[PDB]
Design a protein around this ligand. Structure first.
Ligand SMILES: *[C@@H]1O[C@H](CO)[C@@H](O)[C@H](O)[C@H]1NC(C)=O
Ligand SMILES: *[C@@H]1O[C@H](CO)[C@@H](O)[C@H](O)[C@H]1NC(C)=O
Ligand SMILES: *[C@@H]1O[C@H](CO)[C@@H](O)[C@H](O)[C@H]1NC(C)=O
Ligand SMILES: *[C@@H]1O[C@H](CO)[C@@H](O)[C@H](O)[C@H]1NC(C)=O
Ligand SMILES: *[C@@H]1O[C@H](CO)[C@@H](O)[C@H](O)[C@H]1NC(C)=O
Ligand SMILES: *[C@@H]1O[C@H](CO)[C@@H](O)[C@H](O)[C@H]1NC(C)=O
Lengths: 305, 305
């Protein structure tokens, strides 16, 4: 029969092996295991036999190991796998042939420099991907790499070397989080087809420009965080956009605000009302903003100067 | 209504906020939240209002933050809390007035130097405690500190400064893991009353002696790991013990093995059969062990010299 490794706790389909200095994945675990916690050990690779007879496993936590190598399909026997947590390891690339049931993949704080389309092909249950804190550059992401994920709703690539928004992002996305990178411009083509995008996080980059037409490509966008960048003007298209409600622009280089930067000239009843606009920590001062500029805002607390 | 903090994912009673550099616990989370994941942020303290209206919370993950301070009872509003994970933080002591529903407490890799009985009083649902990787000394553990936990089944104190087995341990214990400390002796009094103890992990200490009578105080002990210590002889009492099956003694200073070190002189049918005995990496050599010494072992693979 199955064995609980010495010091681990195996109770009610949970195998708890965190904090033990283990050097490889334990074998002979109970076949009905639903959650496997191997956080904070010293595992250095995942080999082909590591995950056999764990056909009920829905969660695998490998956070904070020393993994620098994963055999292709090492995870494929995990036919019910939904969550794969690989953060705080030493991966250079994403694992190939992950189980098609996968819903969430976390690879925060690795050494990832290449993101291949192939890793993601057929991963049609994937809803969330977290890839931040990696030395990754824009050249390292194949165009349309994330396109094979037809239900993908959330992606975050944060605190990396990327300099442009990835092209060919899946149109199912509702959240795109690209905070703390080295992005210098928002181009319209990267946002093309993102008609379900609700949130766009571009905070803490070096953005100096938003292409005209950019935001019209995210017609249902509701929240736009562009604080802590190098903007010299408010992004074009806010007045004509019908869904935008939250626009953070604090800590930028904006020296003037024109009268139709936020509001169209005539009250447009089809345009959603602003709930939050931040403009503080910019060269423009409250006394340089024409009163009319926020005529379409009716909650006075919404605008923060 | 409730708010999902920007970049977090709130889905099906799970609030996923890992890897965001957050500096405090988010407020206004959905009231039905069952699991809250705040792993890998920059939270520096838990204040009194932090956990209100989270009455369905069963799991709280605060692993890998910078927490150096927790107000007494900050966690008490968490009336359904079962798992509290506080590993990889900067705590100096354990939180006071934890919820009485608590089943598992993990505080691996903190700066804990004092363990008070008071923290554990009334925690009668507690089954597992992990306290390893802490600068903790034996003087820092009040006598009988763990005694208030009447269902406690597992405790691990590993990779600390402790030099003796804690006294007044709860008699419900089935596992005691004290690997990698600075323990120098096994005294019988520390083991007194541990009649449910099945596993005893004392590996990687500086143990030079096991008091006679020690193991008789754990009458139902099945596994005893004493490898990587400074033993000069096999621990007394193994021949008379009726339950011991696994005895690891590799990497010690054992220079001789007497004929009744493991087996009683006459076959004792009430004594459980050895399944594993390790003796390699000791001064005694295979050619110095009288054949009869393992007469009560019938699986020849059991004994490793
Ligand atoms: C950007 O890439 C270089 C290697 O080309 C790396 O050394 C640097 O730390 C990266 N930035 C980060 C911290 O991701
Ligand atoms: C963007 O659009 C605005 C308003 O129509 C215009 O003033 C500006 O010159 C345009 N920029 C470019 C480079 O096309
Ligand atoms: C801000 O914009 C001005 C001109 O509009 C320019 O002189 C400057 O280089 C920009 N950046 C900073 C950080 O001041
Ligand atoms: C033992 O305690 C001292 C402080 O008295 C500490 O500096 C040392 O690192 C401790 N051992 C460990 C690593 O727990
Ligand atoms: C422990 O017991 C053994 C066997 O009865 C005996 O040889 C030994 O001297 C005892 N040690 C002490 C210090 O009582
Ligand atoms: C081992 O025991 C012997 C005497 O039996 C002693 O000389 C020595 O100090 C002990 N320790 C080591 C590490 O050899």
């Amino acid at each position: 029969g199955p064995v609980c490794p010495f010091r681990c706790q195996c109770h009610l389909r949970v195998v708890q092996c965190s904090d033990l200095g283990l050097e490889k994945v334990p074998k002979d675990l109970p076949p009905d295991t639903a959650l496997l916690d191997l956080q904070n050990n010293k595992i250095t690779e995942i080999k082909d036999g590591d995950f056999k007879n764990l056909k009920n496993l829905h969660t695998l936590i490998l956070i904070n190991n020393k993994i620098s190598k994963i055999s292709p399909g090492a995870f494929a026997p995990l036919v019910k796998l939904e969550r794969l947590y690989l953060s705080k390891n030493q991966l250079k690339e994403l694992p190939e042939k992950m189980p098609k049931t996968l819903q969430e993949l976390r690879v925060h704080e690795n050494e990832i420099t290449k993101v291949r389309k192939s890793v993601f092909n057929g991963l049609n249950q994937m809803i969330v991907v977290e890839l931040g804190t990696n030395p990754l550059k824009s050249s390292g992401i194949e165009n349309g790499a994330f396109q094979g994920m037809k239900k993908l709703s959330y992606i975050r690539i944060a605190d990396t070397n990327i300099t442009t928004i990835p092209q060919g992002l899946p149109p199912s996305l509702t959240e795109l989080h690209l905070d703390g990178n080295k992005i210098t411009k928002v181009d319209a083509a990267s946002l093309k087809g993102l008609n379900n995008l609700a949130k766009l996080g571009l905070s803490f980059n070096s953005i100096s420009a938003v292409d005209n037409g950019s935001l019209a490509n995210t017609p249902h966008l509701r929240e736009l965080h562009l604080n802590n960048n190098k903007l010299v003007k408010v992004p074009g298209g806010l007045a004509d956009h019908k869904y935008i409600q939250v626009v953070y622009l604090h800590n930028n280089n904006i020296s003037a605000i024109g009268s139709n930067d936020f509001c169209p000239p005539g009250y447009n009843t089809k345009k959603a009302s602003y709930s939050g606009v931040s403009l503080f920590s910019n060269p423009v001062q409250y006394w340089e903003i024409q009163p009319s500029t926020f005529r379409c805002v009716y909650v006075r607390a919404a605008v923060q100067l």
